[PDB]
Amino acid sequence: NRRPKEDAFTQQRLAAINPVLTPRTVLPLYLLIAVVFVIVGGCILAQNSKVDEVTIYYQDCMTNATSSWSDIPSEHWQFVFHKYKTYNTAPQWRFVDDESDDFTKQRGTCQIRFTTPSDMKNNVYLNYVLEKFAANHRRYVLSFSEDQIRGEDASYETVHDATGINCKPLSKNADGKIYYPCGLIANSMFNDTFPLQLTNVGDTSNNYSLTNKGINWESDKKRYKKTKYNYTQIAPPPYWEKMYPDGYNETNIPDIQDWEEFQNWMRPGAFDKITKLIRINKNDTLPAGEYQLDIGLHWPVLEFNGKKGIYLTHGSHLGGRNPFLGIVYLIGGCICAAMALILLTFWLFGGRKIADASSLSW
Amino acid sequence: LRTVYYNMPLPKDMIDEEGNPIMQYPRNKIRTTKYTPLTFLPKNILFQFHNFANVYFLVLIILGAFQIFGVTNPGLSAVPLVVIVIITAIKDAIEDSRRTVLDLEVNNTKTHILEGVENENVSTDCKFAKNYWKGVKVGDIVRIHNNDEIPADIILLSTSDTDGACYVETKNLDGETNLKVRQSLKCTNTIRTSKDIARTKFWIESEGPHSNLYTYQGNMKWRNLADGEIRNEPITINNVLLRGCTLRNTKWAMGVVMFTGGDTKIMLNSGITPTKKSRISRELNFSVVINFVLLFILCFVSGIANGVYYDKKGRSRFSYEFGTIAGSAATNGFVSFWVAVILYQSLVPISLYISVEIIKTAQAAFIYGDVLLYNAKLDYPCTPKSWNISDDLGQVEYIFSDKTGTLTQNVMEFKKCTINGVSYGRAYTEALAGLRKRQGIDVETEGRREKAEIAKDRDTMIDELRALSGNSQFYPEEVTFVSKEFVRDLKGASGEVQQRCCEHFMLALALCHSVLVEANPDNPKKLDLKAQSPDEAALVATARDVGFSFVGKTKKGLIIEMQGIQKEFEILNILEFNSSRKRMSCIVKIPGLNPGDEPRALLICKGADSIIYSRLSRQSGSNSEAILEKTALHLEQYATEGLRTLCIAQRELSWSEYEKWNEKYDIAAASLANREDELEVVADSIERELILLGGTAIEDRLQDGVPDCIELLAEAGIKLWVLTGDKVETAINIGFSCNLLNNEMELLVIKTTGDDVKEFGSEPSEIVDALLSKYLKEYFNLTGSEEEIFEAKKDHEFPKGNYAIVIDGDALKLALYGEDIRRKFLLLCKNCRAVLCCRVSPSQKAAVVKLVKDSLDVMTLAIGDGSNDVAMIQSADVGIGIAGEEGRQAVMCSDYAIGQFRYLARLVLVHGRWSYKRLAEMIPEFFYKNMIFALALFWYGIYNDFDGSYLYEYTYMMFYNLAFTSLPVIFLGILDQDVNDTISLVVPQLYRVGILRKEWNQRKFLWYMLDGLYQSIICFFFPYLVYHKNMIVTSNGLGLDHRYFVGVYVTTIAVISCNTYVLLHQYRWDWFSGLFIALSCLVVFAWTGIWSSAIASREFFKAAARIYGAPSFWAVFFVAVLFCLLPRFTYDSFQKFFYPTDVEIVREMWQHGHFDHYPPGYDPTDPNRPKV
């Protein structure tokens, strides 16, 4: 017949709970969430406060530093050490001109001598920070070639004519040799030569070694693969034309699978501040001493008033020193504990019965 | 003006070739459908584009197809709009294909058309061969048999009965429960067989199809045989069979077809089935405009802030990007405006009109598939026919019910009678007005009436031929006692004058009637009663059951089996019942006790009680004035129970005075003075001095739970106005039996008196049609107001005033004419506790609905069955049809179709009250859910100078409104229940939040827009403030600083905080919605666990390995889901403790076991329900 099927789904009789928010169940739900989030945020701020860091901005080293060891002004450097909270022994800095470079906008070597009163632990991260460099405009972040990242000898109509992501302003040069790391992202790669060690000032054969391996994820070598262009087909990018003065030989075409400093720059920063890892040591503790950074200056920032610096740290499991997560869990507890208190003291002094406040039968 | 020719070629008014006639009559096909198959696609697309976001999406495809803004894949972004328009149109065609299968039942149901050539035909023997209903054309000759419906408007030619009389059942055209007599034409009255009608040539000069049920004008012209001459013969309305009618008590009726298709009166009093966009659906366009303003503000801010960046000087755009042109842009905030329009386009989501339509289609599927709206007798479930207005059934304030077939069962039952001032009759009809004080434990009396029927059936076993069973015996009274007979002696007849009064009363009920005799083809030893009115069918059948079996009629008189013996009564005269008379009288002949004498003559008059007590004898010395107090007390007691009363009065005549009366009766019979008042005075002269035998009482049976359904609807604040097609006093009795008139009300009867409609003249002064405006003002001092209806539409009470409006239809035509009298007529009807509108046309039923719907801003229901209710069903906001054994137009034109009236409580108070609250919650939950995600594309604009880059990887933007968040919203709109289905009927006062419109406001929308604006600040700036210090968030220092990885932080907070916001705003956490909230929470981790293992991710390549393995992801996740949900879970907990709604308090009682003693599926409007 036409009698509908009675199976408790079609009759809308599924098993259910019907939760009713009484204050005997809701007010212990706030106190549980409030006690959890003040124990969590109390343990986050304890582990966050023990994160030491060294931030030295060196963008003014050609002009505000001379050929002798003078102090860095306090505008540029910040130290955080939890066992030495009144630490103010300023790092020194020195400029070596290198007149045979003939670039004159950013050349030479900036020699930074910082002092660390406490030792950073086993894994030491040497980041570089960039401020006011905008790597997040909508034409910048789409300008690269996905085919050339995966190690393919892509044509001109697959690096320039692709649909969303293409090397649109920087595809090929005047004679026609297409740029191998193309687009604005790979062209404007950060230049500054950082050393492969920290020179222990005051000691010999105790230099803290650093490396450019283990600088990106190991899983990025499945995507960044060695190229299959010949030297004839490709040319260096128009701002890489000083590292490669003769262009690409049959020996100097860069393997981007093993070159992890390129692989970090091809991941653009989301925000105005950019922090990318460039040196690491996974082996040794960095002892408490005065060390020396020797930065080959090649990267211009002062034409857009941007800063340019160094972030030496051993982070935490949350990463970096940021006081936000510990404060905002403690705010989440002290709000859930306060509005457990406000609704309870409104309940003992207002309050109603659970049966007959209904407007139908007044 | 049409002139239908038959059996004759047309004149030279056939100028149209390729098909000879010009006028092109419609075909006899009903439509009942929203779309014809030709213009389905143009009309359904415009119905979808009256939604304002659908012309918003169409603009984004036009503007996105230009390479100025650089939209990637401009032909793939049209795919989400195109497939939603196709899926909604396939759904609307499947919805509209189910109205066409009921058309094919109606257009194929086997009428009988003569096989003669019809010269009013298109281009593209002589038997009555069986043809289709759609094959009926204008000019056909149709033989309509017994008991089948009539195909078109038929000018009646001949009947099976001699002198050409029919009987039609106009309960489809009207509410008239009596059969109407339709006379055939006296020209073609001898035309009997199929060979006679083929040799007859004539034509009909008619008028236009003018939509008035009670009027027709026509001329039949036929050239006379053996004398060349035209002979006109007038055609009026009682010569006409209309399309809604059904031929009863006649073997065949032949006639000409004149009006087919939309020319018939039931089609002209109806319209095209409207599409009926719901009120929440209509008010959704204004909420989209609130988003068009919010989109405009965000694109205006981003358009001016981008141009402020493009005329700065010390920016890294000049050195490393190759936008080295320091000029070229002073205010380029036009091209940066509409980049943000493409960037922020998901702030009005594509999934809006497809989510809310899966809701409405699946809410219609659960109305269709429940067993408590299933009618087991008709084999008929509730059939939703409009699959998009289930939420309108939760806001209904006014019900405009029909009476006949809708409130009533079309079964009359003789229940009570008075014989010489003794009340004979036992019935528990509506003694349940006492539910205030005493219990509903009186199911013991329904068994106490039941044993008294069996004890009466075992006591009436004297020799009766057709004492068949109790199945045709509907008069339980064990006081049928023939007392002090066959006990003391054999002769007797000394005392017990009441026994002589009982057997003469029931004899008069077997004498004064016009009931004919036909043999039942099943069991031909038992014959049944073929009456005109069903009142007289119940009077003759109940005298048949107590002993006086009317077994036939002769040309001398009636054969009446008076308890075995078939005594013959010679009928002398018959005075037929009439509307002006309100009386039927029968002169019978007493037989002779003295030999050689011509004996006397007895007058037996029956009729209405109000006019027979005028016609009684005041000059008596018997008990003819002390019983008048007892009988008139009873007939007031019977009418307030809701029973049709009918006095029985007599006078014995001397046979010489009767011959003097017959001498004047033959004067008024040999002349044609029947239209004149000559015959009605001769009948009046004999009907003046009368002795009262007593009265009767007949129950017009309601449907099964009709006074229980109206009781639940009135407790919900819903107002019932019975709009009636038949007489005033009939609906007043149904008012008292449905508990709508209460016996202490003041019936404010309008009752116009003059036959003058406000149509012509009488401008400076009137004397006969200022009456209606007068006592509208006079009844506006007991209701002490004049005209203020702006204050009235702020009031949604019942009221408590114990008044009732009875307007008579002809006075309704003048109370609906001008603006100032409509305002006073509405204000009086709104202030009364019951409104009865009687003798009302199909146009005026729609007019009362449109008056209440347009003046007050309210929601109307309009249940009915019958083609007079179609215009009322179509012109209301919802329309309910009540289904029967037959195929009904009011079912096909309706929006829902229930088998019985009592299902309207289960339909409105359960399904509509759910479907209102399911969709008044979901729609603010839906715009909340999108803008928690789309606004983080704006808040990221602050940190890239509003240049126009995307925060999200492109598979997050596709699958947010499609996969990760789409299912908790949809299973809230389909399966959410504030309370159980029994509690919706135990507590009908929970319905009042829909009448007061307290669940869907544009104010409620703005707080969900403000709760959505707040959490996007939480969903963006909580991942921002863990990156903002030094951009390192991973435990191994390797860097998650890509913008797609920040978008993973934001999306996972937004998806979990949405799907747990939807969970907290569900009543009834069941296992089905609880499973698919969890699977929507776990498909955001699963898709990026799969898509970020492929090399096709292209920037995103190991996102789920790197982000989900980062402890800073799982620290941002729990604190940001807190601050998203904490200002709303606190506001609700403050609301639910100190300002609780009624439905929060009823849920508190339901947890405390105040409703556990009700069975699952408890139906209070059920006669066969258990005890509570």
Ligand SMILES: CCCCCCCCCCCCCCCCCC(=O)O[C@H](COC(=O)CCCCCCCCCCCCCCC)COP(=O)(O)OCC[N+](C)(C)C
């Ligand atoms: C452009 C490419 C197109 C390709 C094809 C597109 C998809 C086509 C799908 C095939 C057709 C599906 C039809 C489903 C019908 C469901 C409705 C139904 O069964 O009955 C309906 C039930 O109607 C109701 O009252 C309940 C509401 C219907 C709920 C389900 C609607 C399903 C169809 C519409 C959406 C389908 C999905 C469309 C995606 C494009 C009609 O009732 P009835 O009594 O008149 O039916 C006759 C019953 N008997 C036979 C017993 C007398």
Ligand SMILES: CCCCCCCCCCCCCCCCCC(=O)O[C@H](COC(=O)CCCCCCCCCCCCCCC)COP(=O)(O)OCC[N+](C)(C)C
């Ligand atoms: C728990 C596991 C869930 C697995 C997935 C289940 C999916 C269930 C879907 C049920 C219906 C609800 C969704 C209806 C369609 C939403 C379409 C949608 O939003 O997705 C589109 C995806 O676009 C596409 O290319 C895909 C088109 C697919 C269209 C699917 C239509 C589905 C109709 C289903 C009808 C029958 C339903 C049966 C009962 C559920 C993106 O729109 P957006 O607003 O999210 O983003 C706009 C921004 N851009 C332009 C950049 C993309």
Ligand SMILES: *[C@@H]1O[C@H](CO)[C@@H](O[C@@H]2O[C@H](CO)[C@@H](O[C@@H]3O[C@H](CO)[C@@H](O)[C@H](O)[C@@H]3O)[C@H](O)[C@H]2NC(C)=O)[C@H](O)[C@H]1NC(C)=O
């Ligand atoms: C990264 O390193 C390179 C060199 O190590 C930096 O210098 C860029 O050097 C190229 C070629 O040496 C310059 O192109 C030349 O510009 C001059 C003056 O406009 C023009 O005469 C030449 O024909 C050629 O176009 C380039 O201008 C120069 N970069 C800048 C910003 O001036 C480079 O600056 C470092 N940074 C970036 C973002 O690449």
Ligand code: BEF
């Ligand atoms: F007899 Be009806 F129009 F409900």
Ligand SMILES: [Mg+2]
């Ligand atoms: Mg009616």
